[PDB]
């Protein structure tokens, strides 16, 4: 009830043994009443590292998008080594969403080893189960076996109606995903452990399918963008091997489905200027000049009867003399060019200062023997050259024209494809302009460039007109156990990619959210802009180039920091050699580097002077000892991981304040949230995701099932808890309900339709759906709906939630008017009472933990000891936690070796990985998540609690209690003991 305190463990240890006398009864009682539950106690178990590889093929559905819906790919399996390293080899194949699926090495949900189907953004198939939401559901197939050598799996995705289907060895899989979210791009993905060999058969040259695709399902090789190539790659890496060693990479620039749909400018609506007869006629005539030049240059002639084979020009006259639809076509398109220029910031003009007289308008080619003679050319490029602004203007017009053309094709029903099929309404150019190839860009730009030259000749005066933030900055610091408070230190940083990279020394309390240099903790230098950031921007030195090495040297005794670029010491504006000075020692300093999106860089702390470059230039001469020179093991670095996690609300929060009004008279205990600085200076309001620390767990078996009636009190199974939204807080900005342990949606514009939900339907041999089930990560009801149903509200909205663990349904009731919305959940599910709110008033919300007639309070469900206590209570453990977007994480010392190379045109793209790799995982029971045991080096509270837990184990096992030793062997095994013995870190 109170929580984890090591003093209680010490009390139990004292209870075990006294002055060399072992109380067998006490030891057995403590063991029996503590260990079998395997709850409220840290658990450890060896697991395997799992990696994932995608095919670099991104597809998705959007309104007006230039992409095809149905898709189909295939993966074959060559070799599988089951039960390697004493664990079953993990192998799953499926699809994944770009925004939401981001596996990390170790320390995942459940007990680690996350792969395809361990989150609501991924859907997979392991051979016998359909993996989604970290829940495995068996599926019926003719040959039911795990993925074995010499078997092939065909995966098809239908985006028209959301569906993913699998087929193993031609036998259909009687189960399909459905009704999933379409907010992103779907790409093929395979998750695997060591000792496996798979091969992608992408399509066409990139392997051919063994089995024919289902009708309407195009091969996945037809979705490759023109500017990109088909090649396997990891999903999201934060490190990469290279000739210099481990290169730290930043975030990767992503793509969205809204980029494929084009949004042009409605230039046809713009009213044409009076220029139509003034200069538009001359522009069209100059275009006729260049047209005739094209015909003359080609083998084309001016023959009145149109004969392409004989290359005859229909008009066949120097002057175009074209019929009205022809002449009007030329004039209308010149007018369209004028409309586009007018719609943009440019303004048309005829002020040429009589440049028309100076224009030659004579090509004098003398090669026009046919009737379309006297080819004119103004030599406008010679008369005036195009300015760079004009060239960018040409690019803008070309982009707009392409966008309108694409919109037209989309309206008709065309889709992009790497292979052109006119009968199939597919072309390789429907992709919008920004992703075009340079050849097509030039082909679309040449005519507009000539038109702009004509405009210059005729004198045109046209003149050209939070959550994401965490995904741009990644911080790589050293561990807090490597802090240096004295001496001279040096470390180097090579800029492989130039831009948005800051390197320097930071204090151990460096937060993972605030940018480096914005706070006084980080004394960083940005070499992209040549500015040193300690608390604010200040120019210093010169910007670096590609491959430049910056050496950071720190004088702890002299209280200075010096930055050198390629050996040369960088100077400030005033000429000071040292970037900073008079710096207080304090807690210490640690090397730190931050990289932007798409930026890579090498970090050399100085483990070996041989690999340390430019050391003898400056660092060795003054006496700067390289950082981490004598230590044998490499420095364990900590990277900033952008994964939203729920953490307790700090009491020192300057914006939010959670107060316990528990023990109120004629009122159940409650926790009220208030805004400390509402309506004041620098006050910030934003989405707040709050939850309760302790969950409620449904029963394993769903076997149905004034003064309150005591019999009903004892035999009831329902639970009640309310949330009071205060007067002045708009109910339209609140959401009351429950959340599963897996929830990491830090959306500032959260809406009830943004939740993740996937329906798994398991069918029979006839295709009839025998079972239908839904998986969602949260269940809330919007208070805006209740307030709409019905200025300042002047009333308090008491939304009460009722949950039945016996049957598995939760139903809501707003203020007492009852809510028709209800949710059904699976057995063995733990839910946290949570609310999502946008603060707009001083008093916002109040979590009330109470009871109704014939209804248990939430405390009875939360605590086993008080399961039969009708009186509500708020023990110290129960607390309000808020979602935190960014947290610190530890980089694993070793990573898997995966080869993703294609074997041939027939074999496909072979992915192999055989080097075993394992780690010790520490599991938190209530949160249903695990983390690395080596991460306890900075988590001192958990380290102390686990040390006292081991001491308690030794205490209960003390003095020859062989039965207790055997009981312990179930929890802590020989493999765990030996791995902990060999664990150096």
């Amino acid at each position, epitope marked *: 009830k109170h929580g984890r305190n090591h003093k209680v463990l010490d009390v139990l240890c004292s209870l075990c043994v006294c002055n060399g006398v072992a109380v067998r009864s006490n030891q057995d009682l403590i063991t029996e009443n503590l260990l079998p539950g395997r709850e409220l106690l840290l658990q450890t178990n060896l697991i395997n590292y799992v990696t994932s590889i995608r095919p670099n093929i991104f597809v998705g559905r959007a309104e007006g998008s230039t992409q095809y819906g149905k898709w189909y790919f295939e993966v074959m399996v060559d070799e599988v080594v089951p039960f390697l390293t004493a664990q079953a080899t993990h192998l799953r194949v499926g699809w994944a969403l770009t925004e939401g699926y981001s596996p990390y090495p170790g320390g995942g949900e459940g007990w680690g080893g996350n792969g395809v189907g361990d989150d609501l953004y991924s859907y997979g198939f392991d051979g016998l189960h359909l993996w989604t939401g970290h829940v495995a559901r068996p599926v019926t197939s003719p040959g039911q076996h795990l993925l074995a050598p010499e078997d092939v799996v065909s995966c098809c995705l239908d985006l028209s109606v959301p569906s993913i289907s699998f087929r193993i060895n031609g036998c259909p899989v009687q189960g399909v995903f459905e009704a999933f979210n379409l907010d992103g791009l779907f790409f093929p993905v395979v998750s695997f452990s060591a000792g496996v060999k798979v091969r992608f058969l992408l399509g066409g040259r990139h392997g051919e399918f063994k089995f024919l695709p289902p009708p309407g399902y195009a091969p996945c090789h037809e979705a490759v963008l023109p500017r990109e190539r088909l090649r396997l790659e990891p999903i999201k890496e934060y490190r990469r091997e290279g000739p210099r060693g481990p290169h730290l990479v930043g975030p990767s620039r992503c793509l969205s489905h809204t980029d494929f749909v084009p949004c042009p400018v409605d230039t046809v609506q713009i009213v044409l200027p009076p220029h139509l007869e003034r200069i538009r006629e001359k522009l069209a005539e100059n275009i006729h000049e260049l047209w005739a030049l094209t015909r003359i240059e080609q083998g084309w002639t001016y023959g009145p009867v*149109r004969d392409d*084979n004989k290359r005859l020009h*229909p008009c066949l006259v120097n002057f175009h003399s074209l*019929p009205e*639809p*022809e002449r009007n*076509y030329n004039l209308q398109m010149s007018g369209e060019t004028l409309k586009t220029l007018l719609a943009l910031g440019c303004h048309v003009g005829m002020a040429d200062e009589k440049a028309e007289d100076n224009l030659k308008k004579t090509k004098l080619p003398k090669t026009y023997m046919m009737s379309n003679g006297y080819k004119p050319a103004p030599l406008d490029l010679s008369h005036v050259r195009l300015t760079p602004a004009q060239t960018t203007l040409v690019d803008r017009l070309a982009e707009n*024209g392409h966008n309108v053309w694409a919109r037209d094709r989309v309206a*008709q029903g065309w889709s992009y494809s790497a292979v052109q099929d006119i009968p199939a309404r597919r072309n390789p150019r429907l992709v919008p302009y920004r992703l075009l190839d340079e050849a097509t860009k030039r082909s679309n730009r040449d005519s507009l460039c000539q038109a702009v030259r004509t405009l210059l000749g005729y004198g045109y005066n046209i003149e050209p007109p939070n959550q994401s933030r965490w995904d741009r900055v990644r911080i790589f610091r050293a561990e807090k156990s490597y802090t240096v408070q004295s001496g001279r230190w040096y470390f180097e940083f090579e800029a492989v990619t130039t831009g948005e990279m800051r390197v320097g020394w930071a204090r151990p309390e460096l937060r993972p959210d605030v940018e480096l240099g914005a706070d006084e903790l980080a004394y960083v230098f940005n070499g992209h802009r040549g500015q040193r950031w300690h608390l604010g921007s200040e120019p210093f030195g010169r910007p670096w180039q590609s491959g430049d090495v910056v050496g950071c040297m720190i004088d702890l005794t002299e209280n200075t920091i010096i930055f050198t670029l390629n050996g040369e010491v960088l100077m400030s504006d005033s000429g000071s050699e040292t970037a900073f000075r008079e710096i207080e020692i304090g807690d210490g300093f640690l090397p730190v580097c931050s990289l932007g999106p798409g930026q890579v860089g090498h970090l050399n702390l100085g483990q070996d002077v041989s690999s340390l470059r430019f050391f003898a230039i400056c660092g060795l001469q003054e006496g700067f000892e390289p950082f981490a020179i004598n230590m044998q093991r490499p420095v364990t670095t900590w990277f900033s991981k952008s994964l939203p996690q729920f953490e307790p609300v700090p009491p020192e929060h300057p914006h939010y304040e959670v107060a316990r009004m528990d023990g109120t008279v004629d009122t159940p205990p409650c926790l009220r949230l208030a805004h400390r600085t509402w309506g004041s200076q620098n006050s910030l309001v934003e989405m707040l995701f709050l939850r309760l620390s302790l969950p409620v767990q449904f029963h394993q078996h769903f076997r149905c099932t004034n003064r309150d009636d005591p019999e009903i009190i004892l035999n009831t199974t329902t639970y009640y808890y309310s949330v009071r939204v205060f007067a002045g807080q708009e109910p339209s900005c609140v959401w009351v309900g429950w959340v599963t342990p897996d929830y990491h949606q830090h959306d500032m514009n959260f809406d009830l339709s943004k939740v993740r939900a996937v329906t798994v339907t398991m069918g029979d041999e006839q295709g009839n759906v025998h079972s239908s089930l839904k998986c969602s990560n949260c269940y809330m009801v919007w208070g805006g709906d209740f307030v709409s149903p019905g200025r300042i509200s002047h009333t308090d909205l008491v939304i009460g939630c009722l949950v039945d663990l016996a049957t598995g349904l939760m139903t809501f009731t707003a203020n007492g008017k009852e809510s028709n919305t209800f949710f059904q959940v699976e057995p063995n599910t733990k839910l946290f009472p949570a609310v999502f709110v946008l603060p707009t008033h001083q008093n916002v919300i109040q979590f009330e933990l109470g009871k109704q007639k014939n209804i248990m309070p939430l405390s009875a469900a939360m605590f086993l000891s008080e399961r039969k206590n009708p009186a509500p209570q708020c023990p110290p453990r129960l607390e309000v936690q808020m979602l935190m977007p960014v947290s610190w994480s530890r980089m694993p010392n070793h990573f898997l070796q995966v080869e993703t190379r294609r074997a041939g045109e027939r074999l496909g793209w072979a992915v192999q990985c055989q080097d075993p790799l394992t780690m010790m995982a520490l599991h938190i029971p209530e949160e249903n998540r695990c983390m690395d045991i080596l991460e306890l080096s900075e988590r001192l509270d958990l380290q102390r609690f686990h040390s006292h837990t081991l001491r308690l184990y030794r205490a209960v096992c003390a003095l020859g209690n062989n039965r207790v030793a055997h009981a312990l062997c179930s929890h802590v095994d020989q493999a765990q003991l030996l791995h902990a013995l060999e664990d150096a870190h």
Partner: nanobody
Amino acid sequence: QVQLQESGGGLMQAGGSLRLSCTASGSIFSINSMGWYRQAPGKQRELVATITSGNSINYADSVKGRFTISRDNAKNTVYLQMNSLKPEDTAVYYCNADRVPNGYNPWGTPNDEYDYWGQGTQVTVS
């Protein structure tokens, strides 16, 4: 969106009379050069005589037999009449209205490729 409904070209022996009607329903702008093509079963697609506004007809390799093809801009209609027939004339014929006039577009690829295919009909010769 410009949709070119094409109806006609029923089966007939050699020398029969076949009438085909191509109507281009859609925006009146850029309605021109409602030309013709044919795709033979398992063969190459060939350009039939293309008629444009202004009574301009361009002939090509697919002018077998005797076509009489005439278009009216009032209702965007094209009447094609084959009075003779040959065994090699069996194909799926198509009618296309492109903003390209009289087969001319000395301009950007977007303007040139801006086009509107239709449905067509099957012509079979016994």
